[PDB]
Design an enzyme around this catalytic site. Sequence first.
Site, PDB file in Angstrom:
ATOM      1  N   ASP B  83      39.074  -5.884 -24.878  1.00 39.93           N
ATOM      2  CA  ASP B  83      38.673  -7.271 -25.402  1.00 39.93           C
ATOM      3  C   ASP B  83      37.837  -7.162 -26.471  1.00 39.93           C
ATOM      4  O   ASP B  83      37.381  -6.240 -27.148  1.00 39.93           O
ATOM      5  CB  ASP B  83      37.820  -8.156 -23.965  1.00 39.93           C
ATOM      6  N   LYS B  84      37.519  -8.320 -27.220  1.00 34.75           N
ATOM      7  CA  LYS B  84      36.497  -8.711 -28.411  1.00 34.75           C
ATOM      8  C   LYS B  84      35.533  -9.439 -27.886  1.00 34.75           C
ATOM      9  O   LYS B  84      35.751 -10.393 -27.379  1.00 34.75           O
ATOM     10  CB  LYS B  84      37.565  -9.065 -29.508  1.00 34.75           C
ATOM     11  N   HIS B  85      34.193  -9.250 -28.368  1.00 38.46           N
ATOM     12  CA  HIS B  85      33.173 -10.015 -28.236  1.00 38.46           C
ATOM     13  C   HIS B  85      32.314 -10.189 -29.465  1.00 38.46           C
ATOM     14  O   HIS B  85      32.375  -9.322 -30.421  1.00 38.46           O
ATOM     15  CB  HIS B  85      32.263  -9.625 -27.193  1.00 38.46           C
ATOM     16  N   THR B 123      35.532 -20.887 -28.755  1.00 42.20           N
ATOM     17  CA  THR B 123      36.663 -20.661 -29.122  1.00 42.20           C
ATOM     18  C   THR B 123      37.577 -21.676 -28.220  1.00 42.20           C
ATOM     19  O   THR B 123      38.542 -22.133 -28.477  1.00 42.20           O
ATOM     20  CB  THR B 123      37.146 -19.119 -28.729  1.00 42.20           C
ATOM     21  N   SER B 186      22.658  -9.954 -21.424  1.00 38.10           N
ATOM     22  CA  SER B 186      23.305 -11.281 -21.429  1.00 38.10           C
ATOM     23  C   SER B 186      24.793 -11.157 -21.831  1.00 38.10           C
ATOM     24  O   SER B 186      25.724 -11.482 -21.265  1.00 38.10           O
ATOM     25  CB  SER B 186      22.563 -12.486 -22.365  1.00 38.10           C
ATOM     26  N   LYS B 191      30.990  -9.744 -20.335  1.00 32.79           N
ATOM     27  CA  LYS B 191      31.937  -8.890 -20.835  1.00 32.79           C
ATOM     28  C   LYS B 191      32.345  -7.794 -19.848  1.00 32.79           C
ATOM     29  O   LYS B 191      33.623  -7.511 -19.556  1.00 32.79           O
ATOM     30  CB  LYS B 191      31.859  -8.426 -22.191  1.00 32.79           C
TER      31      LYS B 191
END
Lengths: 440, 440
Positions: B83-85, B123, B186, B191
């Site tokens: 994934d991307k954060h 998003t 946090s 994630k």
Amino acid sequence: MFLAQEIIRKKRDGHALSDEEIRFFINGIRDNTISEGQIAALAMTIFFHDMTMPERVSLTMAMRDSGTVLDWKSLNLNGPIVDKHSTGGVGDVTSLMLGPMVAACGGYVPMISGRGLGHTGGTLDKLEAIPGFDIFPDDNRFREIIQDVGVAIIGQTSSLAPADKRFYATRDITATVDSIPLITGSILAKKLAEGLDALVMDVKVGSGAFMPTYELSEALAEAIVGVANGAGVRTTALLTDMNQVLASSAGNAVEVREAVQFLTGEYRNPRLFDVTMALCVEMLISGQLAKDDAEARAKLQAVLDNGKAAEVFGRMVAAQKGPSDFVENYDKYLPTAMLSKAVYADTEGFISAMDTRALGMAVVSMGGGRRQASDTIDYSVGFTDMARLGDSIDGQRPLAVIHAKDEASWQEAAKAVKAAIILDDKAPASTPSVYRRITE
Amino acid sequence: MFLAQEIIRKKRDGHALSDEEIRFFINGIRDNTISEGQIAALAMTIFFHDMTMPERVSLTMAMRDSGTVLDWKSLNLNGPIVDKHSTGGVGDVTSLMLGPMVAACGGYVPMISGRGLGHTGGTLDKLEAIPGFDIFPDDNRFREIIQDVGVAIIGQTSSLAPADKRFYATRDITATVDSIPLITGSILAKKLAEGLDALVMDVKVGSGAFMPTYELSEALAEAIVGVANGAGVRTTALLTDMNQVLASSAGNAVEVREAVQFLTGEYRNPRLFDVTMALCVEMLISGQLAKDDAEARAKLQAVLDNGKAAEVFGRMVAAQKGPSDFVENYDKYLPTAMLSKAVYADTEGFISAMDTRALGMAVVSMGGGRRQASDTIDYSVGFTDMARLGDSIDGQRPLAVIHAKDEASWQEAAKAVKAAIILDDKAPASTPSVYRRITE
Ligand SMILES: [Cl-]
């Protein structure tokens, strides 16, 4: 509003807060505009960063002003408005003879006091052992007594330095109790709300004391003298010995007995004499009711020796709805305990130490104090005839007379009292009752 | 209980907290058993004394396990969970491209997200300007789409790290959000609960940086990389520029449009391109779908030029219940604003500064965001054809095209855009799109 978080952020980054900013936040606490979390955060930032003398003064005077503040200029009284405050101790009964003594010397003593915190005693709790005593007169009656008597000892209305209510409570669960600026704030905000010309602070050193060490008692005294004079109130502090019980009795009714006896000259504990006379002298010089220590002591010795102070006490007692014959007949009024017997050591020796916090806890356990804020108190229990450091102990010479509710109770205090007192083979160091006097 | 206060004192005095102590506190916050003031005090002690590496992994994983934690191992997938954060910013549309891009490169991207807060749009609020787009598929629907499309983008279909809520809320009013170990927990806990084999973190720098300073931004990026890898996930971070809008547009519907255009090849903003590509390169290298930047760039260029990524995006819109012809026909679906007119500077010169925060907050006031989570979003309003830093502006060159419900919200937004942007006589210095890569 949430300007608060910005003041927190400001203190956090090591910036001193201003008087406007401190006032805002304190008023925020009273008015519940500012949350407990915001309260906690600021307290924490002050633990770490501390506070400059100006921040300290701002903090105290903001808290004082958060509630009602007393003004005696209206009454055109013949003399200064004065009080004593103390960090507390076991058998520290000085206020009871001091208010009357100073009052009999021409001061005016509006002593707004409190209920016993843990092992230390409350003055209010002791006076509630006197039957009929009202610690909550209407503010105007209160002004009558002050004027007609010269001293009154009363309980906090609820209107007073109210900011300390939420701020102290939060400190208690967050480990921010121990910070000297926050302590100088709590200790002084209430006393300063009385509208005094002068104040003396009693800061105890030793095992019985709030402060864990001497240099910390001295740091706290200096903070207080600094902030108080900064507030416009002439103030000195004494560092006094709490290594043993100050009076010869600890409890409620039993402390009031020794109060009367002291004033009437029936019995005077020499160390309790030392500390009481020392605090008063500071009150008389800082109020210009005396030129010097010697003249202060001269006046005070007279008022005490000739019964004046005793009369003042009776009058104040009468005034506050206690017995009109109380000084003379205190015998018949005060509660006496159902079991009162001496406790003896298991060895001979000289008394070389005692854990004064421990003895104090023995009394709360018997019923003389509260752990809870709502614990009910039995006013008869406690100790009398307490032995003093360096006293020779054996089978004739008891450590103390214990006053208890029953045999069960008495046996347990008897354990605590034996364990709290240490006997040696040589009479140890003889300690001074008063260590230094701290001024500006 | 209130040994919570003892944990606070321990941290306050400078000690490291145990994993056990940390999960007791974290869980105490989820379960109400610990109050607001204790949270804030602990946070502040952590602000002051920081935390060590195992402390940090303990905090993040205590938060992560405070709530559900996903497991993809049952579905037997070929290609990594990646994934991307991002710490977020005005006009950052990268997720909408990168998800399809990486999915199209043979990896699986369960992007789980949230709504918008502050100046940065979520998003999911962007994806919800697509008619019918479903941010809440139920559990097998979620599993199905990922198997099929290779990517999906949803809100939290469960409770992922519930303990963050009382803890972030309290931080956000106590001035304790700035703390790198707390942020890290946090930002990472939600994630990590996704059950990823790899993760890339995008930490924005500049006027849109979450951190007050670039050097706090590195530390954040650095701390996130360490903990994630310590938590078992192969993680790298990029520091990327937000000194201006990343895309050429900002809004919800307007962003979706540019987003699609990027993929199909109509328009690719070079700066958006730079960042998007580099984030994808990270996902491919860390998810071991390629062996270096060069090979990774080859593959993503291919899927960008040969249409597969754009394809993945459409499937994913139909699978998520927005129109199935959306890629082709998007202008039929996306609501136009009521008023579109370019806004002009009142002086002439280069764009020296762009306040991005002030920009998202301009969109929110247009109805683009929500200050209450209870609001109604107007999905059409916003900004397009954004001017960029260094552009020379005169009477014929628009700062942006503004999209607003009525001329009254237009003239307010226009005011905000002219407040957003500073002009002066010298062009500013260039800045890279990506400042650095942080690994290991
Ligand atoms: Cl292009």
